[PDB]
Design an enzyme around this catalytic site. Structure first.
Site, PDB file in Angstrom:
ATOM      1  N   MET A  23      -1.523  -6.541  -2.502  1.00  0.00           N
ATOM      2  CA  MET A  23      -1.711  -5.306  -1.731  1.00  0.00           C
ATOM      3  C   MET A  23      -0.605  -4.278  -1.989  1.00  0.00           C
ATOM      4  O   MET A  23      -0.216  -3.526  -1.094  1.00  0.00           O
ATOM      5  CB  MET A  23      -1.836  -5.624  -0.234  1.00  0.00           C
ATOM      6  CG  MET A  23      -3.080  -6.427   0.112  1.00  0.00           C
ATOM      7  SD  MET A  23      -4.599  -5.520  -0.239  1.00  0.00           S
ATOM      8  CE  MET A  23      -4.587  -4.317   1.090  1.00  0.00           C
ATOM      9  N   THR A  42       0.846  -1.225   0.000  1.00  0.00           N
ATOM     10  CA  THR A  42       0.000   0.000   0.000  1.00  0.00           C
ATOM     11  C   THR A  42       0.863   1.250   0.000  1.00  0.00           C
ATOM     12  O   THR A  42       1.855   1.331   0.728  1.00  0.00           O
ATOM     13  CB  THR A  42      -0.924   0.062   1.229  1.00  0.00           C
ATOM     14  OG1 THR A  42      -1.841  -1.043   1.201  1.00  0.00           O
ATOM     15  CG2 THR A  42      -1.704   1.383   1.254  1.00  0.00           C
ATOM     16  N   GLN A  43       0.473   2.223  -0.820  1.00  0.00           N
ATOM     17  CA  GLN A  43       1.144   3.511  -0.859  1.00  0.00           C
ATOM     18  C   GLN A  43       0.124   4.627  -1.034  1.00  0.00           C
ATOM     19  O   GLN A  43      -1.064   4.470  -0.747  1.00  0.00           O
ATOM     20  CB  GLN A  43       2.159   3.586  -2.013  1.00  0.00           C
ATOM     21  CG  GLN A  43       2.727   2.273  -2.510  1.00  0.00           C
ATOM     22  CD  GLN A  43       1.871   1.677  -3.611  1.00  0.00           C
ATOM     23  OE1 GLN A  43       0.663   1.501  -3.443  1.00  0.00           O
ATOM     24  NE2 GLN A  43       2.489   1.388  -4.754  1.00  0.00           N
TER      25      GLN A  43
END
Ligand SMILES: [Mg+2]
Ligand SMILES: [Mg+2]
Ligand SMILES: [Mg+2]
Ligand SMILES: [Mg+2]
Ligand SMILES: [Mg+2]
Lengths: 226, 222, 204, 125, 195, 211, 196, 233, 195, 196
Positions: free
Chosen positions: H107, H1-2
């Protein structure tokens, strides 16, 4: 909801779609969203529907009293000033977003107002979930010095863009035209591009299909004589 | 924070007849209040006289269908071109779904075809692979609008024989494919009127012993 | 937790030819627990009918409030309140509690005693008027009701055909909702007679 | 300051007369004549525009007033008292009726509200 | 507190209420009477939040006793229950609401009928043949649904009650220390002191 | 609502047939008894998929046991294979409350309650689901070891009916099973709508309800 | 938003862009952010549109009432009324206001009233999100006692750069010139200022 | 995730009778700062495909390098690399869709929305969309981000259904696209005046236009707009 | 689960354990035996988290039975308790710890002494004359502190236990459905089947 | 932090302030933010001091090993190695790096690598918290093909303004000149640049 306002030569026109939703469900396929503040001052609302109606009625009532008090026909700037001071006081908790349009002895006017109480002036405006679809059309076709006929056409095309491209908007186009020195003409169901096609089958039931336990006559009358 | 799921709308409907099955779905694809496509087909012929639809999050739906078609292909390789029966497909799909029990395919799956006696068959799955054979199943956005209708007009629930006032039930007469299609179209016409995510087009796949036929109908586009 | 789905319940109203109908289930529960099968959700003030779904304490409170207000109305005006007028009164009364609202979904049904026109209306908990011609629905099975009504309804049904339509709409909707059912009532309303029918339905 | 007249200025005299009301009626007697006539398909109300000076623009002084779109009023007696009653009558037609019922009040009920206002000025402090 | 039950038979109303009072870790009392006589032929049992239950009940009792003296007349159970409901409905939108659930058992001397009203803390009122608050209904209603008849005697009502309390004592995790039972009929209110 | 109880004639297994998602009734025709093999039954409560998937998997393990050992698997051993499996997953979010039911030579009629937090309990009467308390009431006051197969089936049917009536999330239809040493015997699907009125008339119960 | 006000030899000039955004959507591309509170006392608004319109309308009211009783108010006085509103209601307001006016005794004056409701008299002031990108430019290029035409150019070049870099700023550049001569509105379009 | 850092806004596209058109502006935003002005977001792959990318620019540059490596690898041991076994739009799209869905399933998404525009071997128009979630769909018009809300409604007036495509010429289509880019410049706060446009035609091949500008802008009416309600001078 | 008690008298160890098993709202069972025989002269009772209690106990039992077969010898209660403690200490820093508290009652045939060890889920071990886990000690320890003597007989130990269980039944809010009592002495392990 | 790099006719010049803060405390007032990764490939660092030092040391290692095997690396190649580290580790890094180098074929080159690990070749680049205040100034004053002395002045005037407005920037202005002639370090003190 899609709502637009368009200024032209000698007046201003507003229009709206007719779908009202409960989440993703259509509650009313033919809602009338064009409300009257006074005979020649009309508005349309997005956001919390009860707030737009309530705030419209309250200011419409106070505008009428003001007009009677002063012996003058109501001004759009008065509707605007009273709406924004009422809304500002409630800090956005009254979720009323409106386009307000009208003519008065001073001329023709077009304003938007946002729930927190800010207002804006313009020659063309849009509001609601379909406001970006409508504004794309308005930005493509609007010009200075439109005729009445061109403005009704432009405004209804802008609503159509909302109807077809925004899931929040649908059904019909309502229009109200306010030309200087004339009566406002409210054109209910000005366009009808979405008739339900006839179904394949009748679902009328044979009488006696439903099982019943008890019948009684309900006394809706008051107390009988004698 | 990254949300790996979305909702692409859509509604699907599977009905099992005496010697046929239908699997229908609208062709609209949406995110939030926008239309992505008015025609993005959602019901697929998967080979071996099986049709499939996986409704909800479209990326997961495509991934599942695409894994199942692959499973049919490998079933043929590994078992001497034996035809995959609908019950065997159903069990296999449960394992595809449950394999991602802790990161589920966010879809409601329905398959339709014929069982091994030539009777119509519809199977319904939840996102993590619980399934059952059913006569009638709507899935997706307008499922709650459609199912009660179908309860009333297919199974004749709450309908009794006139004159017997509640003593004799309306008898469950057998439905033709033309009759079933009428109910499907009226179901999607009502759903289209009352649900903002349903519209544009209706695509119906009919399964018989002769194979898979396709029918298409326009729906209102607002 | 959500106050409008603690007790459960549904109301539907429909227009036909020179008549209106309004129907409701009879269940009152505390979430999963069924508490009463005799909780009627339709009330009348003269010839105007009001169905109310939602939080049951507010259902009771609002009935008592509108009985109050329509009784004073009658004494002052020397005539029974009409459906259009009552609808505005409901809207006003709900909006006056804008920031501490009653958790209800009211439905009005009646025939204007002067013009003979059949009338229905619905509201959200905060007073917004929904004035559909065909039908109005409310409660925890409202999605199911919109489904039934949309397909079963056609315009200008005679009173005894309208009865079957609205009955089937309510019954099959209630059977797909956990918190609705346990009996049902249907009012058929004409300009001078009103008939009330209790329906036989599954009790689970 | 503060209004410290919190007692009635109209009171019963030994003979049962309410002096101030009688004296108010006497002021009405001196007033310019006004009248009303009810027909089968309408009502008419009329009065004399007695202008105080010929330099006065008498159309700027309205003796007959719209209260609602279907209700009008005329008077005899003190004009300024009439003018403020009309302001209050118009407002009460909205606050205690139109904002509740979404329609204008029937004649008798608006009359009832005006009457209540005038009664209170006969008993209040 | 915890369990309160009520059942209306042919000619009387029976209210059963648990005796335990628990302050978290200890059972402080095993003989607490969770009821107030509102009038000679009306009884109210109660359960909910500590302090608020008794404060509410005594406040209601004071108001009904005041009405009785002022009018020299006993309010009908229906009228008492409507008054109680209004107070609880009023309280739910208060600054700090009464969290109190009640059962009102009364014998109406005018109609010669026993009456049982169930009212929760929100002001949700229902007239019932038998009722309960909290989790009590979950264990007992299936027995009452099975055995209850509208023409039962007082003794048959008490026996059906014993069966209800026995099921509670079997399946409920909390020890509520038995119940105090009271009967409301045409001759007023009495306590059954062997249960 | 699901129940199972031991008696003179073996085991009665009774379940309702409703599945809900929130207040939405997803199905009235769910199968809450899973037929593990011809001699073993399992009941479905909690997660439908978890119960389905792992109890048919259990059937596969039972079959392998009886191939390798040339002998019917005990109910004790069958239940423990399942409870040890779900215990491996503890914390991951499995949701399952089930009765594993069987009747063998060495054990007699046996029921194990198995749980997703790893609980494994041998017992005579179990009731699991949203309407469990309503079923227990009828069951506790009418249960006898010496019930006839006919009265046992009725008691099980009646207990589920009590739950279907009061519990909003229970209903649809009642499925009945009788488990003997020679295998289980299905005793039909019974619509609760039709059943309720029939029981009301014949039994004179539910006087509160107008019929 | 990009707003500024600059004193010069004959008085003061106010300048602003015309963009107002709702997130990334341009809700109005021809806004007028230069508002009149008295004949020759104007302000530029930044922050909440609702708050600054409400404040501006209240100040216009106070100064109209001041004028009726005491004659023409000073620019300092106008800034003091703004300050009072911004300081006493700091908890509920998001307003950054520049006040600019012309007197005959005092000439052109500029007062900036930032978020907390403090007041600062300055030769020139800049504010709004777009102002951050021209602190260096404005500091290097501002002189005291410029001519009208130099001042118009300074403002045009400054706001041109603010508009170029700040996504929240854009549209037309509006200006209001305040001198003894009167009140002059100017407008400059993208094609003029973009290629500077 | 970013979270996306440097981003590109709308990509818009449509089918016409003999091909497809696709366009995107040349901006790389850094939040509300318009940081980078010479960013090319249309990447041609061979002479029959153009991939237009919005969203995170670092991820775009990574995808750009994947496509350039695709062409290298396809030519390995492939004598028909510039003929029957050249890369098709459909191959390039399916590869990207596979990567996008895989990345979301770990993810760790590529924070982009992508439109692949091109012409297949048999002359068929190809136009398909994929995003960071791996969601894919096709339509006679396609747009990402803001373009979806404002461009699609305009482009759909020209081509509203499949049967409108043969009736639409490259000139009507190009003019619709250019008008939409003007509207986005008016209304999107993260758009720029400069943009690139590419036409893939089954007869004339790939035309790639750089350094286009939005022109014929209506701003004149702004002079008459005074105040926000009551104001006069 | 809930209550487990232990007391070491002159020549034996007595362990008392509650019978109830509760799944939230219902009492599922009222005859559950919360103990495992680890060896002929060693008994372990247990309480804590559902599933983990029985899994832990059976795992310990398997290991001690394995040791017994391998060496043809019975480990001393002290050695068994140290093994059990190490396993719980190991578990508290695991990915998912055993939440299980135990009492180990054994008769050491070498030293001819009864021994009671109290071990909590953290691996906190203590040898005691009498012990408990959870809230059980809060109600019972003041009685044991008063009456306990190191030279009591088995019957005197059982009587002191009855007094402990009676105090629990009076003051504890939960109904734990009585206790199963087991005695560990030189002749092994037996159950007292009337309590 | 205020950092920049500017290409000119003979090559490229890097510039930086010398302040590093811990909150409002100046932890070091004479920091060297211009770091050597190869003889004539240097970088300016912004963001986490730990991250950018770690990255710089790793790049210096890669280029030293590149040189041993393949000879002198291009500036593009150096930027590519930086990018790889910043892009693949974007979740765990807070690094904003400008890479500047001199070739004989390619002359002076400047690559900026912002937070997300994208790469952008530019005639000049600015970064760090203080850079926001000179976007307008730098855009207006930068020309291509300036002389060494014009470029030194441009950088000095730019960073002088960044330092003036940004509290996180300050101290001395350091510069590194990269040409065919070699490598020259410059330093300018407060008394010189403050009064510009
Ligand atoms: Mg639409
Ligand atoms: Mg039920
Ligand atoms: Mg196992
Ligand atoms: Mg311990
Ligand atoms: Mg500094």
């Amino acid at each position: 909801t899609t709502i637009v306002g368009v200024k032209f030569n000698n007046g201003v026109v507003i229009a709206a779609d007719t779908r009202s939703t409960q989440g993703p469900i259509v509650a009313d396929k033919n809602c009338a969203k064009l409300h009257r503040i006074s005979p020649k001052i009309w508005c349309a609302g997005a956001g919390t529907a009860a707030d737009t109606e309530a705030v419209t009625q309250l200011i419409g009532s106070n505008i009428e009293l003001h007009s009677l008090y002063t012996s003058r026909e109501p001004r759009v700037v008065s509707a605007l000033q009273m709406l924004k001071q009422h809304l500002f006081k409630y800090q956005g908790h009254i979720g009323a977003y409106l386009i307000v349009a009208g003519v008065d002895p001073t001329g023709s006017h077009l304003f938007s107002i946002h729930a927190h109480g800010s207002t804006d002036v313009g020659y063309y405006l849009s509001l609601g979930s379909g406001s970006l679809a409508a504004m794309a059309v308005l930005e493509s076709h609007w010009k200075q010095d439109l005729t009445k006929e061109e403005a009704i056409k432009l405004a209804s095309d802008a609503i159509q863009a909302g109807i077809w491209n925004d899931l929040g908007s649908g059904s019909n186009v309502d229009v109200c035209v306010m030309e200087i020195g004339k009566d406002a003409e409210y054109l209910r169901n000005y366009l009808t591009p979405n008739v339900r096609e006839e179904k394949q089958k009748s679902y009328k039931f044979p009488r006696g299909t439903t099982a019943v336990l008890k019948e009684s006559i309900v006394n809706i009358c008051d107390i009988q004589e004698e | 924070q990254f949300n790996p799921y979305g909702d692409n709308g859509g509604t699907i409907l599977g009905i099992a007849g005496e010697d046929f099955a239908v699997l229908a779905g609208d062709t609209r694809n949406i995110t939030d209040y926008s239309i992505n496509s008015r025609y993005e087909p959602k019901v697929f012929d998967c080979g071996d006289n099986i049709v499939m639809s996986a409704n909800g999050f479209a990326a997961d739906g495509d991934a599942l269908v695409k894994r199942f078609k692959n499973s049919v292909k490998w079933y043929h390789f590994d078992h001497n071109d034996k035809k995959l029966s609908i019950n065997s497909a159903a069990r296999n799909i449960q394992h595809l779904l449950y394999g991602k029990r802790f990161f589920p395919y966010y879809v409601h799956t329905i398959i339709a075809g014929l069982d091994e006696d030539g009777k119509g068959a519809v199977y319904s799955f939840d996102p993590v692979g619980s399934y059952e054979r059913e006569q009638c199943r709507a899935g997706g956005a307008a499922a709650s609008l459609i199912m009660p209708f179908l309860d009333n007009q297919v199974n004749f629930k709450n309908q009794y024989e006139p004159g017997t006032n509640g003593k004799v039930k309306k008898p469950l007469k057998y439905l033709s494919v033309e009759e079933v299609i009428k109910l499907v179209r009226d179901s999607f016409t009502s759903a289209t009127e009352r649900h903002i995510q349903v519209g544009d087009g209706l695509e119906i796949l009919i399964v018989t012993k002769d194979g898979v036929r396709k029918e298409f109908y326009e729906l209102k586009r607002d | 937790s959500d106050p409008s789905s603690i007790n459960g319940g549904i109301v539907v109203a429909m227009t036909g030819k020179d008549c209106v109908a309004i129907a409701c289930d009879l269940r009152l529960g505390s979430q999963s627990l069924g508490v009463s099968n005799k909780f009627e959700k339709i009330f009348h003030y003269g010839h105007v009918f009001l169905g109310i779904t939602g939080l049951a304490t507010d259902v009771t409170t609002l009935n008592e409030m509108f009985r109050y207000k329509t009784n004073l109305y009658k004494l002052k005006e020397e005539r029974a309140i009409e459906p259009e007028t009552f609808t505005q009164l409901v809207s006003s009364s709900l909006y006056e509690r804008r920031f501490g609202p009653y958790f209800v979904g009211p439905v009005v049904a009646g025939i204007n005693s002067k013009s003979g026109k059949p009338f229905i209306a619905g509201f959200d908990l905060i007073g917004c008027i929904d004035e559909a011609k065909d039908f109005i629905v409310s409660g925890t099975a409202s999605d199911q009701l919109f489904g039934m009504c949309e397909s079963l309804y056609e315009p200008n049904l005679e009173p005894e055909d309208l009865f079957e339509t609205i009955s089937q709409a309510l019954l099959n909707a209630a059977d797909r909702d956990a918190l609705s059912g346990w009996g049902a009532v249907v009012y058929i309303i004409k300009k001078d007679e009103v008939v009330k029918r209790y329906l036989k339905m599954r009790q689970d | 300051m503060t209004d410290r007249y919190s007692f009635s200025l109209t009171t019963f005299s030994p003979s049962g007369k309410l002096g101030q009301i009688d004296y108010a009626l006497t002021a009405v007697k001196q007033g310019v004549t006004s009248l009303g006539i009810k027909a089968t398909n309408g009502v008419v109300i009329a009065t004399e525009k007695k202008s105080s000076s010929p330099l006065a623009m008498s159309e700027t002084l309205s003796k007959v007033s719209l209260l609602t779109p279907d209700i009008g009023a005329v008077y005899s007696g003190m004009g300024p008292d009439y003018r403020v009653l009309v302001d209050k009558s118009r407002k009460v037609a909205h606050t205690s009726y139109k904002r509740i019922y979404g329609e204008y009040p029937p004649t008798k009920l608006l009359v009832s509200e005006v009457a209540k206002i005038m009664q209170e000025a006969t008993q209040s402090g | 507190m915890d369990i309160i039950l009520g059942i209306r038979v042919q000619d009387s109303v029976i209210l059963a209420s648990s005796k335990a009072v628990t302050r978290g870790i200890s059972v402080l009392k095993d003989s607490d009477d969770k009821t107030r006589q509102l009038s000679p032929h009306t009884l109210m049992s109660f359960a909910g939040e500590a302090g608020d239950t008794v404060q509410f009940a005594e406040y209601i009792q004071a108001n009904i006793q005041l009405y009785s003296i002022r009018e020299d007349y006993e309010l009908s159970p229906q009228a008492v229950s409507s008054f109680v409901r209004q107070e609880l409905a009023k309280s739910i939108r208060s600054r700090r609401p009464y969290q109190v659930n009640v059962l009102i058992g009364g014998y109406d001397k005018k109609k010669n009928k026993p009456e049982l009203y169930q009212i929760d803390y929100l002001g949700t009122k229902v007239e019932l043949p038998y009722g309960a608050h909290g989790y009590s209904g979950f264990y007992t209603f299936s027995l009452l649904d099975h055995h209850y008849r509208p023409d039962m005697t007082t003794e048959e009502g008490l026996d059906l009650l014993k069966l209800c309390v026995q099921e509670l004592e079997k399946r409920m995790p909390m020890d509520f220390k038995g119940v105090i039972v009271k009967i409301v009929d045409k001759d007023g209110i009495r306590q059954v002191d062997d249960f | 609502t699901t129940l199972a109880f031991r008696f003179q004639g073996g085991i009665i297994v009774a379940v309702d047939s409703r599945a809900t998602a929130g207040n939405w009734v997803a199905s009235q025709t769910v199968k809450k008894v899973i037929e593990i093999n011809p001699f073993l039954l399992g009941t479905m409560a909690g997660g439908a998929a978890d119960c389905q998937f792992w109890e048919t998997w259990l059937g596969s393990q039972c079959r392998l046991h009886e191939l390798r050992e040339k002998e019917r698997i005990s109910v004790a051993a069958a239940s423990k294979i399942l409870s040890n499996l779900v215990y491996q997953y503890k914390g991951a979010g499995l949701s399952m409350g089930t009765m594993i039911c069987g009747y063998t030579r060495k054990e007699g009629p046996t029921i194990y309650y198995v749980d997703s937090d790893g609980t494994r309990l041998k017992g005579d009467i179990f009731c699991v689901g949203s309407g469990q308390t309503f079923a227990y009431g009828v069951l506790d006051s009418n249960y006898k070891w010496d019930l006839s197969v006919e009265d046992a089936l009725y008691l099980g049917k009646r207990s589920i009916l009590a739950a279907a009536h009061r519990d909003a999330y229970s209903g649809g239809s009642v499925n009945l099973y009788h488990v003997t040493e020679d295998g289980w015997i299905y005793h039909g699907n019974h619509d609760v709508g039709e059943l309720f009125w029939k029981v009301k008339e014949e039994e004179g119960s539910f006087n509160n309800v107008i019929g | 938003t990009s707003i500024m006000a600059v004193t010069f030899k004959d008085g003061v000039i106010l300048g602003a862009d015309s963009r107002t955004t709702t997130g990334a959507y341009i809700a109005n591309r021809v806004t007028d952010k230069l508002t009149r509170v008295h004949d020759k006392i104007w302000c530029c608004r930044s922050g909440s549109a609702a708050d600054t319109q409400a404040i501006a309308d209240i100040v216009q009211y106070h100064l109209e009432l001041y004028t009726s009783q005491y004659g023409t108010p000073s620019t300092e006085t106008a800034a003091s009324v703004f300050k009072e509103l911004c300081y006493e209601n700091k908890d509920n307001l998001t307003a950054g206001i520049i006040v600019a006016g012309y007197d005959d005794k005092n000439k052109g004056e500029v007062y900036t009233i930032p978020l907390g409701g403090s007041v600062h008299k300055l030769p020139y002031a800049i504010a709004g999100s777009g102002s951050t990108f021209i602190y260096g430019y404005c500091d290097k290029n501002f002189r005291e006692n410029m001519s009208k035409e130099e001042t118009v150019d300074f403002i045009k070049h400054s706001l041109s750069q603010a508009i170029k870099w700040d996504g929240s700023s854009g549209g037309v550049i509006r200006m209001v010139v305040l001198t003894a001569a009167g009140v002059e509105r100017l407008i400059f379009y993208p094609d003029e200022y973009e290629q500077l | 995730t970013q979270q996306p850092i440097v981003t590109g806004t709308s990509v818009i596209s449509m089918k016409y009778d003999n091909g497809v058109i696709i366009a995107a502006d040349n901006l790389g935003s850094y939040g509300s700062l318009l940081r980078f002005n010479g960013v090319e977001r249309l990447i041609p792959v061979g002479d029959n495909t153009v991939v237009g990318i919005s969203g995170d620019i670092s991820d775009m540059q990574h995808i750009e390098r994947l496509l350039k490596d695709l062409v290298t690898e396809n030519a390995y041991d492939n004598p028909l690399a510039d003929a029957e076994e050249a890369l098709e739009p459909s191959y390039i799209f399916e590869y990207l869709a596979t990567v996008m869905y895989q990345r979301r399933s770990k993810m760790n998404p590529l924070w982009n929305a992508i439109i692949v525009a091109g012409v297949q071997s048999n002359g068929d128009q190809f136009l398909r969309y994929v995003n960071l979630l791996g969601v894919t769909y096709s339509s006679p018009t396609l747009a990402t981000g803001f373009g979806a809300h404002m461009a699609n409604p305009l482009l759909r007036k020209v081509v509203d259904r499949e049967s409108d495509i043969p009736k639409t010429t490259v000139q009507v289509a190009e003019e619709a696209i250019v008008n939409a880019m003007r509207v986005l410049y008016y209304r999107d706060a993260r758009s720029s005046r400069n943009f690139s446009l590419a036409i893939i035609d089954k007869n004339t091949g790939l035309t790639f236009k750089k350094n286009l500008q939005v022109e014929n802008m209506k701003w004149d009416f702004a002079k008459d707009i005074k105040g926000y309600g009551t104001q006069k001078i």
